[PDB]
Amino acid sequence: ATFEIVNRCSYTVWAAASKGDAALDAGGRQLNSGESWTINVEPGTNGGKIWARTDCYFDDSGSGICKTGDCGGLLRCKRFGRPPTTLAEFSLNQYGKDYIDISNIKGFNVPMDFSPTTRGCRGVRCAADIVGQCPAKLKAPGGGCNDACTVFQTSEYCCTTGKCGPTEYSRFFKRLCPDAFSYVLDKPTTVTCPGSSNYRVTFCPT
Structure with a gap:
């Protein structure tokens, strides 16, 4: 499947793509404002995620640090990133169908649209100003709006x-972005697409 990842933000982001135990494609790249990166994701990939990282510094070896979404200090991510991270999530070719969603379960850093580029299903978006409105206790100093599980580490969150x-915190995310998962047992906002669809992830869609 082809994913085109587009940075419409006014600032640089470092895109990341992983299935948790390996990179997808090259795993990460810098995207200046307006740049597009096209990746290939193997059919049948289960539990893939794409996210943006902000305020990163990397050396010549591809080692460094980002303020949101850092994946063990690497440009090319093999593992998932540190919250807060708005997540585009997908499982492809699962009994004939692809499943896509956006999640705020690991917080929010950058607004996102995740849409098919082929026919037969709708996209989803979370483009509200979650960072600006973030409750004081969830604000991350490095930027972003953490989820409550990350901050408080309780069984309930x-x-x-x-x-x-x-919870009060999950309802905050849900009010601003109804089409994204706000907590683990939220009523699913997954979209079912035809197997072998192609997609575009757009950071800062509006």
Whole structure:
């Protein structure tokens, strides 16, 4: 499957793509404002994610640090990033269907649109100003708006027992971005697309 990752933000981001135990394609790249990066994701990839990282410094070896979404200090991510990270999530070719969603379960850093470029399903977006409106206790100093599980590490926020409900914090994300997951047991906002669809992830869509 082809993903085109587009940075419409006014600032540089460092895109990342991983399935948690390996890079997808090159795993990461710098995207200046307006740049597009096209990756190939193997059919049948389960549990892939794409995100943006902000305020990164990397050396010639591709080693460094980012203020949001750092993936163990590497330009080319093999593992998932440190919250807060708005996530584009996908599982491809699962019994004939692709499944896509946006998630705020690991917080929010950059607004995102995640849309197919082929026919047969709708996209999803979270483009509200979550950082500007972020509750004081969830604001991340490096930028972004953390989820409550990351900040407080309770069973209720992290849904550790597999029973949890919505919270004051999850409802904040849900109010601003209804089409994104706000907590682990949120009513799913997953979209089902035809198997082998292609997609575009746009940072700062509006």
